[PDB]
Amino acid sequence: QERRKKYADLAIQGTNNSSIASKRSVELLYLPKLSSANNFQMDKNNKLLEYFKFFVPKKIKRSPCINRGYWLRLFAIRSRLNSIIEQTPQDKKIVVVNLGCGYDPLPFQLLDTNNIQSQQYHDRVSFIDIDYSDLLKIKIELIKTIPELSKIIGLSNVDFLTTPKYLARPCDLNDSKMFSTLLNECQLYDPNVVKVFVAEVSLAYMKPERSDSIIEATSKMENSHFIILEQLIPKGPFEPFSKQMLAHFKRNDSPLQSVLKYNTIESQVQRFNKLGFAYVNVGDMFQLWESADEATKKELLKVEPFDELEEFHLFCHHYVLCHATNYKEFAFTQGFLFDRSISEINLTVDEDYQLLECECPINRKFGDVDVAGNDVFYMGGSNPYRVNEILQLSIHYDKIDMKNIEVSSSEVPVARMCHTFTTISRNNQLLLIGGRKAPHQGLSDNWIFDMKTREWSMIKSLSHTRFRHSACSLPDGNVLILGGVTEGPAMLLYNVTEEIFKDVTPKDEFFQNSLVSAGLEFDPVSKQGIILGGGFMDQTTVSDKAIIFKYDAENATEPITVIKKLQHPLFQRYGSQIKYITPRKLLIVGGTSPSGLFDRTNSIISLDPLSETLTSIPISRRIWEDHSLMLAGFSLVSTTIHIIGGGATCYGFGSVTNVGLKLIAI
Ligand SMILES: C[S@@+](CC[C@H](N)C(=O)[O-])C[C@H]1O[C@@H](n2cnc3c(N)ncnc32)[C@H](O)[C@@H]1O
């Protein structure tokens, strides 16, 4: 009985351990590499100050995606708190109430007068940490036994603590009344003190009814802000990343319960109005990213090797930063304002092709595949480690077999991902271009694989390392190569016979910037090829264009010419793949968007290049829900098109292997 409670309670307190560690990882890596502005912590000698170390036993390291996610999270809260201090008139005290503080040292960081980066907070700001009794006992003993911390709050087996500028109050927030009492005992009813209630991924664990009570309670406090940061599931509990996230949390015995009722950014808005907060500014983590300045973006890219962007889009859309206010006075200046635009788009449901479940397990991602006549070859990729091995795929109406093809040559290309692999030499060979090992180790060495001899042999290398480029075979047998992370030409043509790479970048201002992970395909029939979506090396912008082009094999200086540009929000996708099913019907598949998650209806769409009309190829609920889907790092083969391979590491909520899909005629 009351045991079942004291367990689910300690499991929730356990999540602090996980998140304080991650924040510490950012203190170790990011903060030292960052300028004064996005710094957070620093003394007069431009020497970084450290606060998360007092609360974390060991040194910790995270994936570049988790590290980025947590920097954004600190920037999220800090930026909000900043808009408040800057604006609040100079005669009002300010109290930041941290609901479920964990070991969060935000108080000491902002109070410490050594830290010149938080000077606006030295004078007139005070803090109250609220959390379970046990977690605070521990936290309070540290604070007392650490001269650096104790000095900051004016100090020299309890669970409470009191100082002029900092309080810590034991309280189970599930207990609405006791919280209502705490609000009163802390004189937060006072109109001459601006309250800033922060719930950083804590109310997320409590039930909708119990968390909302906390919110309504605070709404009775005149002049109060409520900043909440927590998970969303903007397309239901069944969207690929949502599914994984939710399950991860049941596993830890600390499920997200409030998010089940509050799925979207919009529901969060209605929630706060309903509960006494009339004024609400709200966006998801990627709008925060977008909102960061160019000099900050530049820095953040250079902090550490990163190439896990699909993940980052997914993660970002699943965290909302909600800033609410219960008074008209406070303005959401244009510097802090989020834009909100859910433009529901209805697409005609394609009547010619449908989507089948193909249960096919190559269990790898970001390799490449291409068919040489009959046989189907997949090379490299990661599973989750990088390999240089070749699988052969036997595709049947039911499933696909696969066997390792061992090689006879001693020299072999190194394990690599994000390369291309393309049939050349009249289906007799396979071209391997570029790729990378670690994100900071892009490759310039190119190889060819001879099926007849099963020998690898390295050819002319690139002048510039290149990965995440796209590539397709042209009619004449040559290979068109498109962008990727690179310092070289935005478009290459590899003459297979001549053995030369040639810069064929079209004279359109579009190709000014290198296009990363865009869709690319040619059609020998309609004598046309398309380019779809694609991101830019700023890791922020994502093209929404679909660019038709023709290829004049004889024009030696400008073989490729931009025929026609199209523009649709559904074209805005990083890491998608396209393939002609018909010279009039261009299948488009997956990828991620900076502007929101894709769902059942628009994850897979068709395009009629000529008439310019889109149609949806829906994923049935049966497969949306039952089968682990993760259209990222995947490939398309045609015998009937197959969507095999792919997966993602869902922000340390585990990993998700794409199980396989099949497009058939109706
Ligand atoms: C994931 S930690 C985050 C804490 C802090 N905001 C941070 O990011 O480091 C969530 C915290 O909320 C606290 N919490 C959740 N529900 C609570 C409740 N009902 N009463 C008191 N504390 C609660 C937990 O004890 C935990 O320390």
Q: Are residues 145 and 279 in the same domain?
A: yes
- Kindly state the tokens that stand for 289: 């990213």
Distance CA 475, CA 370 (A): 15
Same domain, 408 and 330: no
Between β-strands 161-162 and 166-170, what pairing exists: parallel, antiparallel or unpaired?
antiparallel
Taking the C-alpha atoms of residue 444 and residue 649, their distance in angstroms, rounded to an integer, is 27
Domain that holds residue 78: 1-342
Instruction: Record the tokens describing residue 446, joined without a space.
Output: 């190119």
Instruction: Report whether 155 contacts 144 (CB < 8 A).
Output: yes
Binding-site annotation, residues for S-adenosyl-L-methionine: 23, 73, 100, 131-132, 172-173, 200
Q: Are residues 266 and 382 in the same domain?
A: no
Alpha helix (H) residue ranges in 252-391: 258-261, 265-274, 285-291, 294-303, 309-316
Q: Domain total for the chain?
A: 2
Q: Give the integer Cα–Cα distance in Å for 23 and 11.
A: 20
> In sequence order, what DSSP letters do the residues of 188-246 get, joined into one string?
TT-TTEEEEEEEESSTTTS-HHHHHHHHHHHHTSSSEEEEEEEE--TT-TTSHHHHHHH
Both structure tokens of 320: 């909302």
Identify the domain boundary among 320, 342, 364.
Answer: 342
Ligand 1 atom closest to Cα of residue 174: 19
Quick one: 33 and 97 in the same domain? yes
Tokens of 631: 């259209």
Cα gap 99→176, rounded to integer Å: 13
Q: Which of 342, 366, 385 is the last residue of a domain?
A: 342
> Counting every residue, how long is the chain?
666
Euclidean distance between CA atoms 482 and 489, whole angstroms:
9
Q: What is the C-alpha to C-alpha distance for residues 379 and 376, in angstroms, rounded to an integer?
A: 10
Atom 13, ligand 1: residue with shortest CA distance = 100
Quote the DSSP letter at residue 382.
B
Mutate to test the pocket of ligand 1, among 10, 51, 132 (most ligand atoms within 8 A of CB): 132
The 10 Å Cβ neighbour count of residue 385 is 9
Q: Which among 362, 323, 330, 277 has a CA at the least distance from the CA of 645?
A: 362
Long-range contacts of 325-329, Cβ-Cβ distance < 8 Å, separation of 24 or more: 325/224, 325/225, 325/226, 325/277, 325/278, 325/279, 325/280, 326/219, 326/221, 326/222, 326/223, 326/224, 326/276, 326/277, 326/278, 326/279, 327/222, 327/223, 327/224, 327/279, 328/278, 328/279, 329/223
Q: What is the 3-state secondary structure (H, E, C) of 92-129?
A: CEEEEEEECCCCCCHHHHHHCCCCHHHHHHCCCEEEEE
- 69 Cα–ligand 1 center, Å: 18
| CA pair distance 284, 282, nearest whole angstrom | 7
CA distance 374 to 638: 11
Handedness of CA 66, 251, 176, 4 (dihedral sign): negative
On whether the CB atoms of residues 607 and 546 are closer than 8 A, the answer is yes
Cβ within 8 Å of residue 487, ≥6 positions away: 464, 465
CA angle 300/20/115 to nearest 5° reads 65
Encoded tokens for 614: 């889109």
Reduced to 3 states (helix: H, G, I; strand: E, B; else coil), residue 588 is strand
- Token couple for 431: 């071209």
621 is catalytic: no
- Distance in angstroms (rounded) separating the CA atoms of residues 179 and 203: 13
* Burial per residue of 610-648, b for 16 or more beta-carbon CB atoms within 10 angstroms, e otherwise: eeeebbbbbbeeebbeebebbbbbbbbbeeebbbbbbbb
Residues 625/599, Cβ–Cβ less than 8 Å: no
Statement to judge: residues 398 and 503 lie in one domain: yes
Burial of 7 (0-12, 13-18, 19+ CB in 10 A): exposed
- Compute the 3-state secondary structure of the chain and give helix, strand, coil in percent, each to the nearest 5: 25, 30, 45
DSSP string, 152-182: HTT----S-EE-SSEEEEE--TT-HHHHHHH
Query: Is 619 in the same domain as 491?
Result: yes
Question: What secondary structure letter does DSSP report for 64?
Answer: H
Backbone angles phi, psi at 222, to 5 degrees: -60, 135
Cα–Cα distances in Å, from 231 out to 3, 71, 258, 322, 464?
A: 28, 16, 9, 11, 41
CB 25 within 8 A of CB 70: yes
Could you count the other beta carbons within 10 Å of the beta carbon of residue 426? 10
Task: Let me know whether 37 and 109 are in one domain.
Answer: yes
φ, ψ for residue 118 (rounded to 5)?
-125, 50
Cα end-to-end distance, the chain, whole Å: 56
Q: Catalytic site residue 353?
A: no
Q: Find how far residue 208's CA is from the centre of its chain.
A: 26
Pocket test for ligand 1, best of 12, 15, 214 (most atoms within 8 A of CB): 12
- Boundary (domain end) residue, out of 342, 377, 412: 342
CB-based contact 529:521 (threshold 8 Å): yes
Q: What is the CA(114)–ligand 1 centre distance, in A?
A: 28
DSSP-derived 3-state class of residue 131: strand
Give just the sign of the alpha carbon dihedral 510, 514, 519, 525: positive
- Partner residues linked to 662 by β-bridges: 356, 642
How many angstroms does the Cα of residue 105 sit away from the middle of ligand 1?
13
Place of tokens 């008139």: 89
Q: What is the CATH number of the domain that holds 227?
A: 3.40.50.150
**Tokens, residue 553:** 């094999």
Are residue 338 and residue 354 in the same domain, yes or no? no
Range list of H helices, 46-91: 64-87
Decide: 370 and 422 in contact? Cβ < 8 Å.
yes
**Nearest residue CA, atom 14 of ligand 1?**
100
Residue listed under structure tokens 């109430």? 97
| Cβ–Cβ under 8 Å, residues 298 and 559 | no
Please, where are the H alpha helices in 385-432? none
Task: Report which residue type is found at 214.
Answer: I
Which tokens is 256 given? 């997200």
Distance 200 CA to ligand 1 centre (A): 8
Count CA within 13 A, CB hemisphere, residue 289.
23
Q: Cβ–Cβ contacts within 10 Å for residue 56, how many?
A: 18
User: Separation of 111 CA from ligand 1 center, angstroms?
Assistant: 21
| Burial state string for 438-477 with b = 16 or more CB within 10 A and e = fewer than 16 | ebeebbebbbbbbbeeeebeeeeebebbbbbbbbbbbeee
256 and 205 Cβ atoms separated by less than 8 Å? yes
> CA 345: distance to chain centroid?
23
- Tell me which residue of 189, 292, 276, 165 sits closest to 226, measured CA to CA: 276
CA distance 572 to 593: 6
Q: Which residues of 330-339 are buried (b: 16+ CB within 10 A; e: fewer)?
A: beeeeebebe
Distance from C-alpha of 654 to C-alpha of 656, rounded to nearest angstrom: 7
Strand partners of residue 545: 567
Residues with CB under 6 A from ligand 1: 12-13, 15-16, 19-20, 100-102, 104, 131-132, 135, 172-174, 200-202, 205-206
Residue appearing with tokens 């040489």? 372
Please state the atom number of ligand 1 nearest to the C-alpha of residue 199. Answer: 6
Atom of ligand 1 nearest to the CA of 175: 19
CATH number at residue 597: 2.120.10.80
- Decide if 381 contacts 364 (C-beta within 8 A): yes
Binding residues: 23, 73, 100, 131-132, 172-173, 200
Report the C-alpha gap between 326 and 333 in whole angstroms.
Answer: 16
Residue whose CA is closest, atom 23 of ligand 1?
A: 100
Cα–Cα distance measured from residue 160 to residue 162, given in angstroms and rounded to the nearest whole number: 7
- β-sheet bridge partners, residue 376: 371, 393
Distance of CA 51 to the CA centre of its chain: 27
Q: In this structure, which residue's CA is closest to atom 12 in ligand 1?
A: 100
Cα of 99 vs centre of ligand 1, distance in Å, is 7
27 lies in the same domain as 144: yes
Task: Work out the burial of residue 365: count CB atoms within 10 Å of its CB; fewer than 13 is exposed, 13-18 middle, 19 or more buried.
Answer: buried
Distance of CA 555 to the CA centre of its chain: 42
Catalytic one of 68, 73, 386, 416: 73
Whole-angstrom Cα Rg for the chain: 27
Determine whether 86 is exposed, middle or buried from the number of CB atoms within 10 Å of its CB (0-12, 13-18, 19+). exposed
Query: What is the CA(205)–ligand 1 centre distance, in A?
Result: 8
Q: Which atom of ligand 1 is nearest to the CA of 210?
A: 19
- Ligand 1 atom closest to Cα of residue 103: 9
Degrees to nearest 5, angle at CA 62 with 61 and 64: 125
Q: In the structure encoding, which two tokens stand for residue 154, read together?
A: 């004016």
Token pair in block for residue 21:
């560690």
Q: Are residues 378 and 286 part of one domain?
A: no
Query: Nearest 5 degrees, angle CA 40-CA 43-CA 44?
Result: 130
Residues 466 and 382 in one domain: yes
| Catalytic position from the list 205, 378, 494, 580 | 205
DSSP-assigned states of every residue in 601-620: TTSEEEEETTTTEEEE-PPP
Cα-to-centroid distance, 477 and ligand 1 (Å): 60
Residues 96, 72 within the same domain: yes
Tell me how far CA of residue 87 lies from CA of 6, 127, 331, 587, 592, in angstroms.
42, 18, 8, 51, 37
Peptide bond into 384 cis (omega under 30): yes
